[PDB]
Scaffold this active site. Structure first.
Site, PDB file in Angstrom:
ATOM      1  N   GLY A   1       0.787  -1.219   0.000  1.00 22.00           N
ATOM      2  CA  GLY A   1       0.000   0.000   0.000  1.00 22.00           C
ATOM      3  C   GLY A   1       0.821   1.272   0.000  1.00 22.00           C
ATOM      4  O   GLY A   1       0.474   2.248  -0.667  1.00 22.00           O
TER       5      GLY A   1
ATOM      6  N   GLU B   1       4.485   4.166   6.558  1.00 19.94           N
ATOM      7  CA  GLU B   1       3.191   3.518   6.408  1.00 19.94           C
ATOM      8  C   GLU B   1       2.279   4.360   5.525  1.00 19.94           C
ATOM      9  O   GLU B   1       2.526   5.549   5.323  1.00 19.94           O
ATOM     10  CB  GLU B   1       2.541   3.309   7.778  1.00 19.94           C
ATOM     11  CG  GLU B   1       3.210   2.256   8.647  1.00 19.94           C
ATOM     12  CD  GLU B   1       2.756   0.850   8.323  1.00 19.94           C
ATOM     13  OE1 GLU B   1       1.684   0.444   8.820  1.00 19.94           O
ATOM     14  OE2 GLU B   1       3.471   0.149   7.575  1.00 19.94           O
TER      15      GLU B   1
ATOM     16  N   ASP C   1      -4.315   2.258  11.496  1.00 18.89           N
ATOM     17  CA  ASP C   1      -5.652   2.161  12.082  1.00 18.89           C
ATOM     18  C   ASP C   1      -5.604   1.744  13.549  1.00 18.89           C
ATOM     19  O   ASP C   1      -5.719   2.581  14.443  1.00 18.89           O
ATOM     20  CB  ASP C   1      -6.513   1.176  11.288  1.00 18.89           C
ATOM     21  CG  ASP C   1      -7.989   1.281  11.628  1.00 18.89           C
ATOM     22  OD1 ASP C   1      -8.787   0.511  11.052  1.00 18.89           O
ATOM     23  OD2 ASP C   1      -8.354   2.119  12.480  1.00 18.89           O
TER      24      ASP C   1
ATOM     25  N   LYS D   1      -5.957   7.038  11.532  1.00 14.37           N
ATOM     26  CA  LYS D   1      -7.320   6.846  12.019  1.00 14.37           C
ATOM     27  C   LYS D   1      -7.394   7.090  13.534  1.00 14.37           C
ATOM     28  O   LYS D   1      -6.373   7.038  14.219  1.00 14.37           O
ATOM     29  CB  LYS D   1      -7.807   5.440  11.652  1.00 14.37           C
ATOM     30  CG  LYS D   1      -7.880   5.200  10.150  1.00 14.37           C
ATOM     31  CD  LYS D   1      -8.853   4.084   9.811  1.00 14.37           C
ATOM     32  CE  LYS D   1      -9.157   4.043   8.323  1.00 14.37           C
ATOM     33  NZ  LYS D   1     -10.217   3.048   8.007  1.00 14.37           N
TER      34      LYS D   1
ATOM     35  N   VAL E   1     -11.333   3.832   3.255  1.00 16.64           N
ATOM     36  CA  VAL E   1     -10.991   4.697   2.137  1.00 16.64           C
ATOM     37  C   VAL E   1      -9.999   4.009   1.198  1.00 16.64           C
ATOM     38  O   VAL E   1      -9.170   3.213   1.638  1.00 16.64           O
ATOM     39  CB  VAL E   1     -10.405   6.035   2.635  1.00 16.64           C
ATOM     40  CG1 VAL E   1     -10.522   7.076   1.570  1.00 16.64           C
ATOM     41  CG2 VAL E   1     -11.137   6.510   3.872  1.00 16.64           C
TER      42      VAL E   1
ATOM     43  N   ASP F   1      -6.368  -0.031  -1.311  1.00 10.90           N
ATOM     44  CA  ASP F   1      -7.133  -0.876  -2.221  1.00 10.90           C
ATOM     45  C   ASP F   1      -8.421  -1.453  -1.646  1.00 10.90           C
ATOM     46  O   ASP F   1      -8.660  -1.421  -0.439  1.00 10.90           O
ATOM     47  CB  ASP F   1      -6.267  -2.038  -2.707  1.00 10.90           C
ATOM     48  CG  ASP F   1      -6.148  -3.140  -1.676  1.00 10.90           C
ATOM     49  OD1 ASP F   1      -5.838  -2.826  -0.509  1.00 10.90           O
ATOM     50  OD2 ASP F   1      -6.373  -4.317  -2.026  1.00 10.90           O
TER      51      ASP F   1
HETATM   52  N1  LIG Z   1      -7.869   0.263   1.188  1.00  9.38           N
HETATM   53  C1  LIG Z   1      -7.793   0.495   2.607  1.00  9.38           C
HETATM   54  N2  LIG Z   1      -7.203  -0.426   3.449  1.00  9.38           N
HETATM   55  C2  LIG Z   1      -7.131  -0.216   4.765  1.00  9.38           C
HETATM   56  C3  LIG Z   1      -7.640   0.924   5.332  1.00  9.38           C
HETATM   57  N3  LIG Z   1      -7.399   0.821   6.705  1.00  9.38           N
HETATM   58  C4  LIG Z   1      -6.763  -0.368   6.907  1.00  9.38           C
HETATM   59  N4  LIG Z   1      -6.629  -0.912   5.755  1.00  9.38           N
HETATM   60  C5  LIG Z   1      -5.981  -2.251   5.568  1.00  9.38           C
HETATM   61  C6  LIG Z   1      -6.155  -3.066   6.805  1.00  9.38           C
HETATM   62  N5  LIG Z   1      -4.994  -2.685   7.653  1.00  9.38           N
HETATM   63  C7  LIG Z   1      -4.894  -2.880   9.088  1.00  9.38           C
HETATM   64  O1  LIG Z   1      -5.810  -3.400   9.703  1.00  9.38           O
HETATM   65  C8  LIG Z   1      -3.625  -2.422   9.839  1.00  9.38           C
HETATM   66  C9  LIG Z   1      -4.053  -1.477  10.971  1.00  9.38           C
HETATM   67  P1  LIG Z   1      -2.600  -1.193  12.089  1.00  9.38           P
HETATM   68  O2  LIG Z   1      -2.901  -1.757  13.462  1.00  9.38           O
HETATM   69  O3  LIG Z   1      -2.313   0.294  12.188  1.00  9.38           O
HETATM   70  O4  LIG Z   1      -1.394  -1.892  11.513  1.00  9.38           O
HETATM   71  C10 LIG Z   1      -3.921  -2.038   6.754  1.00  9.38           C
HETATM   72  C11 LIG Z   1      -4.553  -2.183   5.380  1.00  9.38           C
HETATM   73  O5  LIG Z   1      -4.111  -3.447   4.859  1.00  9.38           O
HETATM   74  C12 LIG Z   1      -3.927  -3.488   3.454  1.00  9.38           C
HETATM   75  C13 LIG Z   1      -2.613  -4.191   3.137  1.00  9.38           C
HETATM   76  O6  LIG Z   1      -2.826  -5.577   3.085  1.00  9.38           O
HETATM   77  P2  LIG Z   1      -2.002  -3.619   1.538  1.00  9.38           P
HETATM   78  O7  LIG Z   1      -0.869  -2.644   1.753  1.00  9.38           O
HETATM   79  O8  LIG Z   1      -1.508  -4.800   0.733  1.00  9.38           O
HETATM   80  O9  LIG Z   1      -3.128  -2.929   0.792  1.00  9.38           O
HETATM   81  C14 LIG Z   1      -8.240   1.874   4.531  1.00  9.38           C
HETATM   82  O10 LIG Z   1      -8.766   3.044   5.093  1.00  9.38           O
HETATM   83  N6  LIG Z   1      -8.321   1.669   3.168  1.00  9.38           N
HETATM   84 MG   LIG Z   2      -5.396  -2.858   1.444  1.00  9.77          MG
END
Ligand SMILES: Nc1nc2c(ncn2[C@@H]2CN(C(=O)CCP(=O)(O)O)C[C@H]2OC[C@@H](O)P(=O)(O)O)c(=O)[nH]1
Ligand SMILES: [Mg+2]
Ligand SMILES: Nc1nc2c(ncn2[C@@H]2CN(C(=O)CCP(=O)(O)O)C[C@H]2OC[C@@H](O)P(=O)(O)O)c(=O)[nH]1
Ligand SMILES: Nc1nc2c(ncn2[C@@H]2CN(C(=O)CCP(=O)(O)O)C[C@H]2OC[C@@H](O)P(=O)(O)O)c(=O)[nH]1
Ligand SMILES: Nc1nc2c(ncn2[C@@H]2CN(C(=O)CCP(=O)(O)O)C[C@H]2OC[C@@H](O)P(=O)(O)O)c(=O)[nH]1
Ligand SMILES: [Mg+2]
Ligand SMILES: [Mg+2]
Ligand SMILES: [Mg+2]
Lengths: 187, 183, 183, 176
Positions: free
Chosen positions: B50, B105, B109, B137, B159, B165
């Site tokens: 991401g 990052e 979240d 967040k 979002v 994604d």
């Molecule tokens: N699209 C999109 N995704 C989100 C959002 N928010 C959390 N995501 C994905 C879910 N997420 C978490 O739960 C991590 C929270 P933390 O405790 O801070 O590490 C990170 C995002 O994961 C996506 C990865 O697999 P990627 O990099 O391969 O896309 C968001 O707004 N929008």
């Molecule tokens: Mg994602």
């Protein structure tokens, strides 16, 4: 039989002596992990670092009277950045989480204790129920590490040994015994 | 592009680049005496996939020399989404021992995968370790990690865009917005 | 900034973006009407870590929806250099069966690792498989695999910038230039 | 016992397994009688089998392990989590399997290793199921041909369990 005519100068441990000790370790481990693990509802987890301790873990689990599960890790060194690390590179991580698991680190030999110290500390961060270390061989320079090895098969001198998983340039692993190399091999 | 999937635009492409230029300038000044003092540059560690779009713009916004590093991680359970313990599919290519490291990052979240990552990288013994995220967040504001650099503080809505994604789509968007009907 | 490291600049930042802008329209025209007919997007497979900076600009130049995929590859040594068979450190996150795939490289030199890579992805049976590289050296024209999209023709000299490195340095440059051998 | 009430029947006893592996080791040793014989194993079912197999093979053998994962619910294409440590160019390679059922993951693997251009490439499995006759691979060495029933033991698992069994048997349907 032979397999490597002349490469082995002296024999440190015979194949029967190895298996006999493993049988002893299994009963010992079997008694320490008796009561607990099978009632917990989650078996004894054997985490092994590729690929020397593969021959050792296959015989050990079949020597342990308590049900055991297998887990394998693949690590490589970040080059000479060892001395002040002891951090190792991960090529294949654990398949599942080890939370609340009774975990037994199974190595074939512990020399410096630095890759083992990082590995043991790494698994601790995953918060398992239990974490102990079982090694087949322990060399003198392990006394200078901070990790407690609960199960030790043999204490050997500080000489480079091959056989039973132990290698030199990916060789001599298929040996059923553990012995010392003949220095006219390093060329 | 993606007709009828994007409801609203939370952040426009202009707002993103404007903040990154400002965020880059802040980081560039904080790590200014690094080339001349250690001589190893600032290492930007990125979690696939991401924050890949964010680091390419962030690093080009940072006026001091920066190096790139990438990690590939996967979630176990249940385990991650409560523990923060994550699986590693691709570890670092080189050792970060004695290095000034910036975790980059795209969005934070819960803050637990970041908590595990920060704690994991600390065991590798870097010289310094700070966190730079584009989006933040509300639940991350009260977590166990100190985030030195934040691009935007957003509400907790799902979002997408700019790396973010939904089923591997909308990553190529230059702006960041929310999905609507049948997605 | 790298004050005493860049001797000459082969490609300026404007020229780089100009071709990518041209490539995006070119790729965008070749992959027109793909989302609505197949029901899937254009997949951009990238090899870490040279073309990571390139794909973020390339994908944002392509007017049709695109998806991302990243690979981490390592050399066996001795045998890669003359075979092109490479070690996989990070495979694809998903299967590319029946997908229209665009291989994105940063530089194509010998063409041996690219040939092995192309055969590997072909065995996964995608719908289409093409190759897009930003830079191409003269000895790459030699044989195997069709490189459908080429950004620039550069001489066979070691250049850094825009993802290209020398010991993980000079990656953050917005331009592509030649190093001074006293580096 | 080890798992009281999970093993209903025993398909192959421990002594029968080791006796057959002894024959497989002896047979392989004569066919490969220039470096060592490379035993490529797919994690992690065939780890108990390869350790016994290599110690049954009278010619020097080297070890290599791969970790693969499935992409989901066709071509046998699997995700690679752990590749080979070294290149197998001009190497005599023996693929060591634990069980050959459909033959689809083995076919992708066999063709994949072939692309690395080894001197020789053969497949050795301990167990082979009836639906393997429709696979794309020629299996030179087979330990046992077993019926199409779900068996555990000697590396074979059910939710990562029963791997530590020294024998191969059938599960009790009140386990599923
Ligand atoms: N699209 C999109 N995704 C989100 C959002 N928010 C959390 N995501 C994905 C879910 N997420 C978490 O739960 C991590 C929270 P933390 O405790 O801070 O590490 C990170 C995002 O994961 C996506 C990865 O697999 P990627 O990099 O391969 O896309 C968001 O707004 N929008
Ligand atoms: Mg994602
Ligand atoms: N053959 C053979 N090896 C030894 C010996 N001693 C230390 N090794 C290998 C080299 N070594 C270290 O120096 C670190 C010791 P520690 O951090 O305590 O685990 C790890 C040992 O295992 C070698 C692995 O690379 P491998 O399993 O992939 O082959 C020894 O007598 N004999
Ligand atoms: N900096 C920098 N490197 C070059 C150049 N040229 C070939 N390299 C590296 C060597 N090379 C090849 O031999 C590829 C052959 P092909 O099969 O056609 O892709 C690609 C470059 O490798 C570096 C990547 O692994 P990386 O992105 O991880 O840094 C060049 O001008 N400049
Ligand atoms: N326990 C246990 N498993 C079986 C059996 N049969 C096939 N399996 C596993 C599922 N399987 C197949 O259906 C064959 C695919 P192909 O390579 O094309 O022949 C391979 C077997 O290995 C499962 C791997 O995930 P593992 O090595 O990590 O355990 C069986 O009787 N019993
Ligand atoms: Mg060794
Ligand atoms: Mg390079
Ligand atoms: Mg299984």
């Amino acid at each position: 039989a032979e397999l490597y005519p002349g490469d082995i100068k002296s024999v440190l441990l015979t194949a029967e002596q190895i298996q006999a000790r493993i049988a002893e370790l299994g009963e010992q481990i079997g008694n320490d992990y008796r009561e607990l693990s099978a009632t917990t509802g989650q078996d004894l987890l054997l985490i092994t670092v590729l690929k020397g301790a593969v021959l050792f873990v296959t015989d050990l689990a079949r020597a342990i009277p308590v049900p055991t599960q297998f887990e394998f890790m693949a690590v490589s060194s970040y080059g000479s950045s060892t001395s002040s690390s002891g951090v190792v590179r991960i090529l294949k991580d654990l398949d599942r989480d080890i939370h609340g698991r009774d975990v037994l680190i199974v190595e074939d030999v512990v020399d410096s204790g630095l890759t083992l110290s990082w590995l043991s500390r790494n698994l601790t961060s995953r918060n398992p129920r239990s974490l102990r270390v079982c090694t087949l061989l322990r060399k003198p320079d392990a006394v200078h590490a901070n990790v407690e090895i609960a199960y030790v098969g043999f204490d050997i001198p500080n000489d480079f040994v091959v056989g039973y998983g132990l290698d030199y340039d990916e060789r001599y692993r298929d040996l059923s015994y553990i012995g010392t190399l003949d220095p006219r091999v390093y060329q």
